[PDB]
Amino acid sequence: VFNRPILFDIVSRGSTADLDGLLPFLLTHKKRLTDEEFREPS
């Protein structure tokens, strides 16, 4: 349940409760926080 515009939005608020669920998401989907999908362009 995490893509680019949501992650950038959640951390901007300052609430780690909403982002409880990355640690399932990165692992079972083969995702990293250095991919082009989780990084803005240019």
Resolution in Å equals: 3.5
* Whole-number Å distance between alpha carbons of 27 and 11: 20
List Cβ neighbours of 19 (8 Å cut-off, separation of 6 or more).
2, 7, 10, 11
32 CB contacts (<8 Å, ≥6 apart)?
Answer: 26, 38
In whole angstroms, how far apart are CA 13 and each of 10, 16, 21, 31, 42?
A: 5, 9, 17, 23, 23
Q: What span, in angstroms and rounded, lies between the C-alpha atoms of 17 and 10?
A: 9
Reported residue count of the chain is: 42
Environment class of 22 (CB within 10 Å of its CB; exposed 0-12, middle 13-18, buried 19+): middle
* Experimental technique behind these coordinates: cryo-EM
CA 31 from centre of chain: 10
